Amino acid sequence: GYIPEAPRDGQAYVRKDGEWVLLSTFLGSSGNEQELLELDKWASLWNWFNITNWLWYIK
Amino acid sequence: GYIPEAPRDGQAYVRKDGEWVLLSTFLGSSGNEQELLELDKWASLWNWFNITNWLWYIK
Amino acid sequence: GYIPEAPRDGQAYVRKDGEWVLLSTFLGSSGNEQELLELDKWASLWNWFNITNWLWYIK
């Protein structure tokens, strides 16, 4: 059929069940961004533990 | 001016080549969900391999 | 009270501000896909450093 009409608030919406649903809901954000941004956190520690990396190297 | 929407069965589709295309196809689905869910699997072994971590700690 | 129509060139767009916006922008692949595909690279070395894993195992 036809159903052209979506909200305009700068946000993004997808076509689902003849309804506008925030695409972000299909992305899986707010429930998996952890694994996406975790490496950024763990990397910090690993990146700092380099002190033992070089020391042992030039020990 | 306007284009026909897709069916209504709980699924979602995007605007591509004037046709309905499951967004999931754009997310890759299985084509990259592996690296997204791999750490969850490998973490398990690493997490259970802590037995040797504390061992050295408490000797 | 309707949607433009979106272009037809093989690309895809979502419903945003009453305009066609490449969903890919919401997937995340512009100055961050690195952290997404980095593990694939670093894994190579980690996967290769197994030489020391088995060596120490079988001495």
Alpha carbon distance C8, B59 (integer Å): 67
> How many residue contacts between B and C have a Cβ separation below 8 Å?
39
Q: Report the run of H or E that residue C21 belongs to, with start and end.
A: strand C19-21
B16 in A contact zone (CB under 8 Å): no
Q: How far is CA C34 from CA A27, A40, B22, C30, in A?
A: 18, 11, 26, 9
Cβ-defined contact of A18 to B39 (cutoff 8 Å): no
| Domains of chain B from N-terminus onward | 1-59 (1.10.287.210)
What is the residue-wise DSSP string for A37-50?
HHHHHHHHHHHHTH
Q: Please state how this structure was obtained.
A: NMR
- Provide the token pair at A59: 């020990």
Residue B12 makes CB contacts below 8 A (sequence gap 6+) with A14, A15, A16, A17, A21, A26, B22, B23, B24
CA distance B45 to chain A (A): 17
E strand spans, chain A: 12-16, 19-22
A4 exposed, middle or buried (CB, 10 Å; 0-12, 13-18, 19+)? middle
Let me know: does C42 contact A46? Beta carbons within 8 Å: no
Residues of chain C with Cβ-Cβ distance to A4 below 8 Å are: 1-3
Are residues C34 and C23 in contact, defined by beta-carbon separation less than 8 angstroms? no
